[PDB]
Short mmCIF file of C-alpha atoms in Angstrom, two decimals:
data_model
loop_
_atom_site.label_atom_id
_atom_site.label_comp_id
_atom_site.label_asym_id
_atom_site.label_seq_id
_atom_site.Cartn_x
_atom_site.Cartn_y
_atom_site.Cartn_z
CA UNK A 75 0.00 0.00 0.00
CA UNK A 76 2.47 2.97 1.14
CA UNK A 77 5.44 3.62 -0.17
CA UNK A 78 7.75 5.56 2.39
CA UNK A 79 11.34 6.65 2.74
CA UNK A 80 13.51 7.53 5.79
CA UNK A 81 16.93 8.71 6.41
CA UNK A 82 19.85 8.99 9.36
CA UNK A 83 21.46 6.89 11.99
CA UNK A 84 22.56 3.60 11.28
CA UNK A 85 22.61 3.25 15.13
CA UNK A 86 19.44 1.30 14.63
CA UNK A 87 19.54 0.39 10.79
CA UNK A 88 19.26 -3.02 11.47
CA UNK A 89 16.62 -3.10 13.43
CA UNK A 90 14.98 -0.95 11.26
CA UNK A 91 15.45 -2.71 8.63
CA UNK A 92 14.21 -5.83 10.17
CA UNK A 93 11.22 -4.56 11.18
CA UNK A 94 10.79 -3.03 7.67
CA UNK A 95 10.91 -6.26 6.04
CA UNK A 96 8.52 -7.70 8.54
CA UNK A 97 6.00 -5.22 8.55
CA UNK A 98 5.80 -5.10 4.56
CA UNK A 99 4.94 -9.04 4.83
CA UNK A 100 2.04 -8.25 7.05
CA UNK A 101 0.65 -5.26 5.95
CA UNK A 102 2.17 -4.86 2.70
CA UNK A 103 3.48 -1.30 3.43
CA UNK A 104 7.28 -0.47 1.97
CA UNK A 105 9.39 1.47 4.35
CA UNK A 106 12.69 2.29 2.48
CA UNK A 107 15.64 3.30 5.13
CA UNK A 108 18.94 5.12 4.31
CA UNK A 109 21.66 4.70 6.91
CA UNK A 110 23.59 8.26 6.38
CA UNK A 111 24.30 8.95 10.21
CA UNK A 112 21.96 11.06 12.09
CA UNK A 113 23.57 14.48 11.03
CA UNK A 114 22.61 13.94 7.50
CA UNK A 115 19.34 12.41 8.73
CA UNK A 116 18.31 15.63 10.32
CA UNK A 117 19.61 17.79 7.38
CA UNK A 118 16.84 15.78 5.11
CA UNK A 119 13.91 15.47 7.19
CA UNK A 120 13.97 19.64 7.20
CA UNK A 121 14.68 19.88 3.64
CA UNK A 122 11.56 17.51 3.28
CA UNK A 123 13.25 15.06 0.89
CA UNK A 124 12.17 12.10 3.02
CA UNK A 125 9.22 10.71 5.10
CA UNK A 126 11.01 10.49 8.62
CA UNK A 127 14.68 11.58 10.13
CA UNK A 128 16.41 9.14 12.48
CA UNK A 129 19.29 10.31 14.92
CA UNK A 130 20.47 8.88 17.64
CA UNK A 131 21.45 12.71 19.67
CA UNK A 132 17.98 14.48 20.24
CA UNK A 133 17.63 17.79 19.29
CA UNK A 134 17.04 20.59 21.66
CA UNK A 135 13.30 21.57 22.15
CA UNK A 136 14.07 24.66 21.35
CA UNK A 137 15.20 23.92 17.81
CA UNK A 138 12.25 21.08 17.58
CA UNK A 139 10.20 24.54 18.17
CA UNK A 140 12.15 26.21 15.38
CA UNK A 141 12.25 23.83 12.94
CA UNK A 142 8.22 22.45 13.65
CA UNK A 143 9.41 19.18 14.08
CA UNK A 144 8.42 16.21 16.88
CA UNK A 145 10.81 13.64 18.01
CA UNK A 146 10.15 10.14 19.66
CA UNK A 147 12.72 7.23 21.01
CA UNK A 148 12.39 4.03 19.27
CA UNK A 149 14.98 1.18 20.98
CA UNK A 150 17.73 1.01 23.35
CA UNK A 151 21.40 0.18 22.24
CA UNK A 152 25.09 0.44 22.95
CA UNK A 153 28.09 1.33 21.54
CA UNK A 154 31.18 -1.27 22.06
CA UNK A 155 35.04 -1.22 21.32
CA UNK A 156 35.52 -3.81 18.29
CA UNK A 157 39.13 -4.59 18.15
CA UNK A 158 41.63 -6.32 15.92
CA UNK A 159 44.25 -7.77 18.42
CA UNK A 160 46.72 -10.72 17.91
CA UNK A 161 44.99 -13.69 20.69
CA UNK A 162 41.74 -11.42 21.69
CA UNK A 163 38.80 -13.20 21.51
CA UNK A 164 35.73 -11.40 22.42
CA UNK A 165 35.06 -10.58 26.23
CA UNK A 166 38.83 -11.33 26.89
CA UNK A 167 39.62 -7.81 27.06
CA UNK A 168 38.36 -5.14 29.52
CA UNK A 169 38.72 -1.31 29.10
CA UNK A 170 37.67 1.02 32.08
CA UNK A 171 36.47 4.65 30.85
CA UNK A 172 39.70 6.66 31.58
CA UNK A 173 41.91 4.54 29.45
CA UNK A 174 39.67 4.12 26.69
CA UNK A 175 39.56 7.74 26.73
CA UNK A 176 43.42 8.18 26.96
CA UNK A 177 43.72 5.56 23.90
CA UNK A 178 41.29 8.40 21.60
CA UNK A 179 43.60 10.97 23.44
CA UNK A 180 46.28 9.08 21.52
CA UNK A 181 48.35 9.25 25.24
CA UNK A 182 47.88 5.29 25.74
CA UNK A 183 49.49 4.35 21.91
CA UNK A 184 50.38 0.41 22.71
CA UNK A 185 48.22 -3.04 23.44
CA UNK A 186 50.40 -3.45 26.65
CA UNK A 187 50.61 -0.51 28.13
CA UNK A 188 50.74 -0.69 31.88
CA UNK A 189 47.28 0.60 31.98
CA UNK A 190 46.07 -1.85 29.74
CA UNK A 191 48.35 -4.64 31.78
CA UNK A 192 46.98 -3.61 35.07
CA UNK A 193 43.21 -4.04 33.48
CA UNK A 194 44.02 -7.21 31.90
CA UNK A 195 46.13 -9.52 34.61
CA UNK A 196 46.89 -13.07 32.98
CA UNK A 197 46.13 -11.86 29.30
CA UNK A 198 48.80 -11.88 26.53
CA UNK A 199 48.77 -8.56 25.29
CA UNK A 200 51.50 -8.12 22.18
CA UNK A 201 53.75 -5.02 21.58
CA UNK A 202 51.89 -3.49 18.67
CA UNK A 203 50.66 0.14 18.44
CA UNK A 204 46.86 1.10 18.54
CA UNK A 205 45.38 2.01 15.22
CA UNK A 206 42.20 3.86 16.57
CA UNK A 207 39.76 4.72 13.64
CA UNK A 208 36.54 6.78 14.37
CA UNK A 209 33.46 8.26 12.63
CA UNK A 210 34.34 10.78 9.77
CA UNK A 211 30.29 11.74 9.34
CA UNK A 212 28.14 13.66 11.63
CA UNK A 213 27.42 10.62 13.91
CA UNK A 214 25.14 10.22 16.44
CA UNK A 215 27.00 6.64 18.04
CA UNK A 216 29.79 9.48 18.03
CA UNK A 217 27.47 11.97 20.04
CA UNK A 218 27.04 8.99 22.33
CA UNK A 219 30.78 8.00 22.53
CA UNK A 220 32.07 11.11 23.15
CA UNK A 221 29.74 12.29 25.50
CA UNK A 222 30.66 9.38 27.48
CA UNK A 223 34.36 9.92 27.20
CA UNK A 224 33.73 13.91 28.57
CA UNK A 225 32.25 11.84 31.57
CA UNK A 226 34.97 9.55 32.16
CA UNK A 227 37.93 11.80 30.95
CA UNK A 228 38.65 15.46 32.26
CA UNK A 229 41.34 15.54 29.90
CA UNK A 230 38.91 14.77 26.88
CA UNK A 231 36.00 16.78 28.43
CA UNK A 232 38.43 19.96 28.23
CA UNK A 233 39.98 19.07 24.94
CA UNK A 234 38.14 17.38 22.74
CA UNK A 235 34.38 17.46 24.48
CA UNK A 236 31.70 15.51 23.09
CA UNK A 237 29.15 16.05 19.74
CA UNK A 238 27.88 14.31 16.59
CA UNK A 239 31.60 15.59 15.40
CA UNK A 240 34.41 16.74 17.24
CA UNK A 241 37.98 17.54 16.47
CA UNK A 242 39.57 13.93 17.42
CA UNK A 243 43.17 13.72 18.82
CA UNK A 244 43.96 10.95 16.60
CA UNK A 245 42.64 7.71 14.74
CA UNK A 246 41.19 6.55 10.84
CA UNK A 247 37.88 8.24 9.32
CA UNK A 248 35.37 5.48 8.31
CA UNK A 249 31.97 6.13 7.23
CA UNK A 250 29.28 4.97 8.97
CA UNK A 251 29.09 2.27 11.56
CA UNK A 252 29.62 -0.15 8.66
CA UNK A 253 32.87 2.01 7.83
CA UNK A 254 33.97 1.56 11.16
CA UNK A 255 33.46 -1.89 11.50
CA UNK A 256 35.10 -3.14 8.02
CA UNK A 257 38.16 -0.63 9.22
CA UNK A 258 38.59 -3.09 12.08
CA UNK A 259 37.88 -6.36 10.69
CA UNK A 260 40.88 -5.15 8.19
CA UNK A 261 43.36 -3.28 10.07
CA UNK A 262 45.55 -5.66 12.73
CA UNK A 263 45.26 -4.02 15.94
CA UNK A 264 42.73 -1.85 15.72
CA UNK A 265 39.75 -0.08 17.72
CA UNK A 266 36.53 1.29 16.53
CA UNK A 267 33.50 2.39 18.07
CA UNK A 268 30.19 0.75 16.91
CA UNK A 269 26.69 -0.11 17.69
CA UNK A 270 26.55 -3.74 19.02
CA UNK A 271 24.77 -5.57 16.31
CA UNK A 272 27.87 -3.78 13.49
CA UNK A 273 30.30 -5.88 16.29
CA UNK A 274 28.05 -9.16 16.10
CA UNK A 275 26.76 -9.07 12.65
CA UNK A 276 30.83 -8.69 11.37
CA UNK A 277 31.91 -11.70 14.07
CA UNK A 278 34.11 -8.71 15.25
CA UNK A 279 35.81 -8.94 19.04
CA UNK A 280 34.65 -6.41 21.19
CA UNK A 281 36.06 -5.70 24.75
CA UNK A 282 34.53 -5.52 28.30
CA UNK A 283 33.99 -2.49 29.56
CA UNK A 284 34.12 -0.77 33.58
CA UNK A 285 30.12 0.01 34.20
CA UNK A 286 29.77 3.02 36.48
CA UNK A 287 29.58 1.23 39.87
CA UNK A 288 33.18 0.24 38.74
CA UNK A 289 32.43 -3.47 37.48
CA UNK A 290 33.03 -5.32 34.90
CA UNK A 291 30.14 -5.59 32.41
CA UNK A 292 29.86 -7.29 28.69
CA UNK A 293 27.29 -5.90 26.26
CA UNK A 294 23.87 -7.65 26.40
CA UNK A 295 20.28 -6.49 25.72
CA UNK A 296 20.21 -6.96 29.40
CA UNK A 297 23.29 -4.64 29.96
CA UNK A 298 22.02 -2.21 27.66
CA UNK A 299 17.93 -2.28 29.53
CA UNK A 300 19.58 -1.74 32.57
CA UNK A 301 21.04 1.62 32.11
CA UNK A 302 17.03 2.49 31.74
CA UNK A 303 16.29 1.25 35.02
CA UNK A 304 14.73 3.75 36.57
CA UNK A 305 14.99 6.48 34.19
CA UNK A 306 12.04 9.45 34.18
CA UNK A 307 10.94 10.20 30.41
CA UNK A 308 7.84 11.72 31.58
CA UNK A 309 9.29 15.22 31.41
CA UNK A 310 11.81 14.84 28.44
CA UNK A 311 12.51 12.00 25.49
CA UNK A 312 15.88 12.93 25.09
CA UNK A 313 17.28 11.12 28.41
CA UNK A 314 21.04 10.31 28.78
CA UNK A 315 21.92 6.48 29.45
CA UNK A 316 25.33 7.01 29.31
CA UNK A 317 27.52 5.24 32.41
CA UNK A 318 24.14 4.82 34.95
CA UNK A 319 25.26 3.42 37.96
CA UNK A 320 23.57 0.34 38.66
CA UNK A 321 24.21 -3.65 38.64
CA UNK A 322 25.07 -4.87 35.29
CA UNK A 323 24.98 -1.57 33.79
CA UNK A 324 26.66 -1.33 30.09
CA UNK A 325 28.20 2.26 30.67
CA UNK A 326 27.76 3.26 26.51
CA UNK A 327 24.46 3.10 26.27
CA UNK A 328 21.25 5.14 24.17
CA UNK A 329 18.24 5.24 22.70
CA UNK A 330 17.77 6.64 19.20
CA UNK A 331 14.96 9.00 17.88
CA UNK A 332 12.61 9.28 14.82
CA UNK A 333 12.02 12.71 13.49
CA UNK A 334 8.54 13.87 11.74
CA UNK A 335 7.11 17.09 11.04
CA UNK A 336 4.57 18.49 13.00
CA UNK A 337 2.77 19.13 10.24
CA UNK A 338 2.59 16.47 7.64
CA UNK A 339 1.64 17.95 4.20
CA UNK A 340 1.18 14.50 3.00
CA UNK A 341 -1.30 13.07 5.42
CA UNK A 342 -1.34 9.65 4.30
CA UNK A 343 2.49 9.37 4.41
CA UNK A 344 2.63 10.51 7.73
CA UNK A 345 0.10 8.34 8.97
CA UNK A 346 1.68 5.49 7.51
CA UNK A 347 4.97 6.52 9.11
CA UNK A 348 3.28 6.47 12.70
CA UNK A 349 1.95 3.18 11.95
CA UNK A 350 4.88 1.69 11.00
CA UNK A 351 6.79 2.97 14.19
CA UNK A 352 3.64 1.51 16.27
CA UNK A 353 3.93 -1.84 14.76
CA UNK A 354 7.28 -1.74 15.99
CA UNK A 355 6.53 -0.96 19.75
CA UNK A 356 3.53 -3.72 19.55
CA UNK A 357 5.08 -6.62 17.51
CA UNK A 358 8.68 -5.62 16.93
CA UNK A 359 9.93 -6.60 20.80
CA UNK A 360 11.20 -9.81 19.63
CA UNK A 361 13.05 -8.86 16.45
CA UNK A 362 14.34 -6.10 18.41
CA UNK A 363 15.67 -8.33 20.92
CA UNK A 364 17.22 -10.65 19.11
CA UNK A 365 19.05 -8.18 17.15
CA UNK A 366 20.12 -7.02 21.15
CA UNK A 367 18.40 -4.01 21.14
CA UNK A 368 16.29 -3.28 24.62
CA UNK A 369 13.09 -1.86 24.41
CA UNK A 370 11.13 1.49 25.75
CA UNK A 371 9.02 0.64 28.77
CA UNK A 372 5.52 0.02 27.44
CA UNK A 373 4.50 3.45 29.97
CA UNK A 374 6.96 5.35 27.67
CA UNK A 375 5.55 3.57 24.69
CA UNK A 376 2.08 5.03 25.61
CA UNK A 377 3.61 8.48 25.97
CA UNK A 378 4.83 8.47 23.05
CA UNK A 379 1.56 8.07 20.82
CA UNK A 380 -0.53 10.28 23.65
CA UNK A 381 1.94 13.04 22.00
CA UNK A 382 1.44 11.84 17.76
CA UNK A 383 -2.47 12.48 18.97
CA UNK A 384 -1.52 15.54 20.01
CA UNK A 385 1.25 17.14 18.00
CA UNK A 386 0.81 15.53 14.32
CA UNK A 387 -1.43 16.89 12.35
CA UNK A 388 -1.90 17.60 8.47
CA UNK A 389 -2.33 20.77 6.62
CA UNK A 390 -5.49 21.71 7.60
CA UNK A 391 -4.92 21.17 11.52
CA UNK A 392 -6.73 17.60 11.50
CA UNK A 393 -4.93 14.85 13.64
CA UNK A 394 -2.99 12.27 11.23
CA UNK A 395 -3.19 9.45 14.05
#
């Protein structure tokens, strides 16, 4: 029946894209998806070239104001360090938040450096340099990353800070979490930042990581849920997850957002679009899941279409949903 098109974050592509494929063998419905990163997402979605923006850094209220736009979290999921070490399986190594920092600093420049040693007791770690490669597009698993750094890092909080780009220290430019990830899976010791399911889809080792309450944690859809424990989103969508304190609490952790306008001049297409989204809060859990991505709490969930009844409408100020 409809025929739409949406464009940002590959954060959640494929998810996305799962539940694209699913939904157009139930309903018949097409939702094309274009994983450009979320800066490039927002860029179209204002320029009204596509149905829906994704990105995975909100956007202030003020410019939703501005711009007439209405954003809404979709999934939960978290950013790991995929390496390319001689030995390293995944799991076997663990990273704590300062170091990790220090190694995009481009301070910490070797596999067994004493503060890598001192993380890693009993693990072979070989003398070869780091080859750290990062996001070269407006990325929103960058906003995430690097706002997490500025947490765990005064000396990258004062240098560097955090943002969907910032001026990094050091490292490789790939494109797109699937840049990243192909970087790694090519270049011997190596580091990249990506969304779990880039680490798992590409059999890529990823490392452990130092949760807030200063344990270590692996990346699970239970790791990643956890960080939402007990999180408020009645006042504001745009929460941080970023190292929650907490049991079992995967410190790089986010949710990811869907961008429409508040005023749909195609009415149909936007209706469609919120349809497609709800299928995905109703039905999608499982497909979400197994692709490791946690879920909004059903209470959220509601919240979220109280506001598309509320603040979606169509040219002539009728409600689209």
């Amino acid at each position: 029946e409809a025929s739409l098109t949406g464009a940002g974050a590959t954060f959640p592509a494929p998810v996305y894209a799962k539940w694209a494929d699913s939904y157009q063998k139930e309903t018949g419905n097409k939702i094309n998806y274009q994983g450009i990163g979320s800066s490039g997402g927002v860029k179209q979605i204002i320029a009204n070239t596509v149905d829906f923006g994704a990105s995975d850094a909100p956007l202030t209220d003020e410019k939703l104001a501005t711009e007439g736009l209405f954003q809404f979290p979709t999934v939960i999921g978290g950013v790991v360090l995929a390496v390319n070490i001689p030995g390293i399986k995944s799991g076997e190594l663990t990273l704590d938040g300062k170091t990790l920092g220090d190694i995009y600093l481009g301070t910490v420049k070797k596999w067994n450096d004493p503060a890598i040693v001192k993380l890693n007791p009993g693990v072979k770690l070989p003398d070869q340099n780091i080859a750290v490669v990062r996001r070269a597009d407006g990325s929103g698993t960058s906003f995430v990353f690097t706002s997490y750094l500025a947490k765990v890092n005064a000396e990258w909080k004062e240098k560097v800070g955090a943002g969907s780009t910032v001026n990094w220290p050091t490292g490789l430019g790939g494109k797109g979490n699937d840049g990243i990830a192909a970087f790694v899976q090519r270049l011997p010791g190596s580091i990249g930042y990506v969304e779990y399911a880039y680490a798992k889809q590409n059999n890529l080792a990823y490392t452990k990581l130092i949760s807030a309450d200063g344990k270590p944690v692996s990346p699970t859809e239970h790791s990643f849920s956890s960080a939402a424990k007990g999180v408020d989103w009645s006042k504001s969508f745009a929460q941080d997850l970023t190292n929650q304190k907490g049991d079992d609490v995967w410190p790089i952790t986010s949710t990811t957002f869907i961008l429409v306008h508040k005023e749909q001049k195609n009415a149909a297409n936007g209706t469609e679009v919120l349809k497609f989204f709800d299928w995905g809060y109703t039905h999608g859990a499982k497909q979400a899941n197994e692709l490791d991505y946690a879920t909004l709490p059903a209470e959220v969930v509601e919240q979220v279409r109280a506001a598309w009844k509320t603040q979606i409408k169509d040219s002539s100020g009728k409600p689209i949903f």
